């Protein structure tokens, strides 16, 4: 078997079905205790539930899904009738995703969109019947961040006031894109210092809030 799939493993058998907290717990016990992996983990998640709760979006965007630790690390957060769009290449990890959320019980609030990020974006308003984007948060690959961020505001899908959450924007590091928001008057941007997931290693979030063109 896999990493991921030891890890829902665990879940299933260290959590409560239906209780997306102790799901978040499991994942970050086991990934402290046994094997690391690239969930945004809890040092970085504390930051991230800061910012939920502080615009309450009705639609978010996920660029990255792996185990859907951030899926249910968000959408437990999310008020009744607002959605997650979660986008994964990796069709083993849609599948992890997919369980995990079913045993935390979300399932209803996430949807899961099979492909790479740059071919599905240009398919969120016509296939997916969206308008535009509340927040995007960016945990998916390095050089994919720029670009990514270029088509969504190319496909119409960013309005006054999306929030744009990056992760890793240190570790690995994202610097064509933080060079670009930092610089750009169409973005205004804030840096939020933590830690790599279940490591003692200085990473980062960037938030950046698209202006307008
Ligand atoms: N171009 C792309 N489109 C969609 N998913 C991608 C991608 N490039 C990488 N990925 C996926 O991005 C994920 C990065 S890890 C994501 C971790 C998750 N956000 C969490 O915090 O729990 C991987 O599962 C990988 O397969
Ligand atoms: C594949 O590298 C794994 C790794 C190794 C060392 C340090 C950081 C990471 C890392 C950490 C993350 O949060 C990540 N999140 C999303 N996509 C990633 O590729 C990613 C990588
Ligand atoms: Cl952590
Ligand atoms: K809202
Ligand atoms: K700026
Ligand atoms: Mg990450």
């Known amino acids: 078997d896999t990493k991921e799939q030891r890890i829902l493993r665990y879940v299933q058998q260290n959590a409560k079905p239906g209780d997306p907290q102790s799901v978040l717990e499991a994942i970050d016990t086991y990934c402290t205790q046994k094997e690391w992996a690239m969930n945004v983990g809890d040092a970085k998640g504390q930051i991230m539930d800061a910012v939920i709760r502080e615009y309450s979006p ?26 997650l769009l979660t986008m994964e290449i990796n ?21 899961i969109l099979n492909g790479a990020s740059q071919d599905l974006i240009p398919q969120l308003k016509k ?24 088509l969504l505001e190319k496909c119409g899908l960013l309005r006054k006031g999306t929030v744009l959450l990056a992760d890793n924007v240190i570790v690995p590091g994202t610097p064509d894109f933080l060079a670009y928001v930092r610089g750009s008057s169409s973005f205004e941007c804030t840096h939020y210092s933590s830690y790599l997931e279940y490591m003692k290693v200085v990473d980062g979030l960037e938030k950046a809030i698209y202006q307008g063109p």
């Open 58 to 83: 009705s639609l978010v965007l996920e660029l990255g899904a792996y185990c859907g630790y951030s899926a249910v690390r968000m959408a437990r957060l999310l008020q009744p009738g607002a959605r």
């Open 127 to 150: 296939k997916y019947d969206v308008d535009t984007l509340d927040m995007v948060f960016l945990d998916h690959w390095k050089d994919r961040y720029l670009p990514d961020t270029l």
């Open 91 to 111: 069709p083993d990890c849609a599948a992890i995703t997919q369980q995990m959320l079913n045993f935390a019980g979300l399932q209803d609030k996430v949807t």
